[PDB]
Amino acid sequence: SCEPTRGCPTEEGCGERFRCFSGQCISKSLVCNGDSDCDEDSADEDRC
Amino acid sequence: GHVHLSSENKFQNSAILTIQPKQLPGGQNPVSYVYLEVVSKHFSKSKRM
Amino acid sequence: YSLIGNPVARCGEDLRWLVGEMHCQKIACVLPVLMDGIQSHPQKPFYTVGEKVTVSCSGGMSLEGPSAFLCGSSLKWSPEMKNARCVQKEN
Amino acid sequence: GTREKFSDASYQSINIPVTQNMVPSSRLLVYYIVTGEQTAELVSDSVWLNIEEKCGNQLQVHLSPDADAYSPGQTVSLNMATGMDSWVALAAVDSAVYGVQRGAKKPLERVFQFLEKSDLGCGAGGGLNNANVFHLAGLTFLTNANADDSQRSYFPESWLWEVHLVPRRKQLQF
Amino acid sequence: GEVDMVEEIDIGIISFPDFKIPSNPRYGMWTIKAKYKEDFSTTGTAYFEVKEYVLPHFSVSIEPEYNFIGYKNFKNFEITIKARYFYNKVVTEADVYITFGIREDLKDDQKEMMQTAMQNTMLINGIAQVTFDSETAVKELSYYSLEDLNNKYLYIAVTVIESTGGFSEEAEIPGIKYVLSPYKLNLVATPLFLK
């Protein structure tokens, strides 16, 4: 057991980036490119 | 500015801010619009406006 | 009272307050130059905001310039004419 | 504002008290945040707010003698009535000074319409995703989920050019 | 195209000294700008014209039945000319002279005109109304009689003189252009979005 003193670090800002199922935020230009755009999963897929 | 968060305020608060003539005298442009920062225990972010 | 100055005071790192050339001045009128040749009307020690004073000299002569003077905000007349002139003669 | 969500109904009505500072115009935006499995996403919306034109000080001018016509040279008294202490600026402008002048509209005729220019955003409200609608409403948000993209007699006119202090009830004679 | 500058420290109502017109004035629409001059923005702009307001006798208001002449108003267009005193009372009786004209644009102040009227009507109870057909005007003075050929303003001049006493007052309308295209549409207080 431990006493938390410092606050936990919040998640990174995903600014103007299509979020994937994991969290790998990449540029929006890769949407509907017909390939391994996110390189992790095809969750979003931009309905391409 | 400094705020206080508690269960009574439901973790929201608003503080008034002022922009006084502290800008550098002269220069090529006196705008230097703003750099806004937030000091919190769990998060920290900055943005220009 | 009226505000003249910055007026903002700033807290410094040395636990001191940086204050500029600020003062707290008035937004009541006082007695005029009170020349022996002129006569004020009405003759009151203190004047309130919104009242006017009719200054004139003795008989046979008429005041040069504006005949009526109005009490401004405070320590303010529209013309002052401090010992300038009342009347030489109006022929 | 802030409210709580219950399962009593699908739509909840919120009560918003209006103040004297919101006479010319206003805007309201309602946004709620949710907790996603991977990433969060908040939704917002805004619609214009129109109001009437009522003064806070409630300054009204009225002459003490009540008659349809006044005789030339008649001594009249004017009474000012305000809610709080305020400074007045009186101006007696003739109705005949209004020449053709392509209509000669008015001296000012506009106090709230020119005050409406303080609104940063344009349009009525509503729009695309939270960034676009907040930029259209005149705001910029900071959250972890989404970002915002910047993309001699008688008689000459005029007379009665004076400034006087006015208590709750002040009256002058001329 | 500046004349004088003056600054004053401020109550809430900034009082300024009375300005004086130079010995050689320039008639036209002047310009008044105000700035804080230290550090600020939002300069205010005010306008005032220098002209001769020596004696206005009575206000002459021209309120046409329709704003702009359309197809139905081409054969018959009735316009109301009312002259009223400044003390809220209408004019009992006065002779009203109507003058018509055709102008190409609002910038051009001098244009040819009929030359046909010169219509004389009498003001009754502070209100007068007369019927004016556009066909005779467009056929006589305009040199071509068709509503599609002429797309330009219509200038009307009104000279009202009193029959019981020597007086004269004039009024005018900026212009009414014959446009084949109908009036334009726009949206106000309407969000162009869907729920």
Coordinates of N, CA and C in Angstrom, one line a residue, chain C residues 2-7 19-26:
Chain C
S2 N -12.5 61.8 -8.7 CA -12.1 61.3 -10.0 C -10.8 60.6 -9.8
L3 N -10.6 59.6 -10.7 CA -9.3 58.8 -10.7 C -8.4 59.3 -11.8
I4 N -7.2 59.6 -11.4 CA -6.1 60.0 -12.3 C -4.8 59.3 -11.9
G5 N -4.3 58.4 -12.9 CA -3.1 57.7 -12.6 C -3.2 56.4 -13.5
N6 N -2.5 55.3 -12.9 CA -2.4 54.1 -13.7 C -3.8 53.4 -13.8
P7 N -4.5 53.1 -12.6 CA -4.2 53.2 -11.2 C -3.6 51.9 -10.6
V19 N 3.8 51.2 -7.3 CA 2.7 52.1 -7.5 C 3.2 53.2 -8.4
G20 N 2.4 53.6 -9.4 CA 2.7 54.7 -10.3 C 2.3 56.0 -9.7
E21 N 2.4 57.1 -10.5 CA 2.0 58.4 -10.2 C 0.5 58.5 -10.3
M22 N -0.2 58.0 -9.2 CA -1.6 58.1 -9.2 C -2.1 58.9 -8.0
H23 N -3.2 59.6 -8.2 CA -3.8 60.5 -7.2 C -5.3 60.4 -7.2
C24 N -5.9 60.7 -6.1 CA -7.4 60.7 -6.0 C -7.9 62.2 -5.9
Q25 N -8.3 62.7 -7.1 CA -8.7 64.1 -7.2 C -10.3 64.1 -7.2
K26 N -10.8 65.3 -7.0 CA -12.3 65.4 -7.1 C -12.8 65.3 -8.5

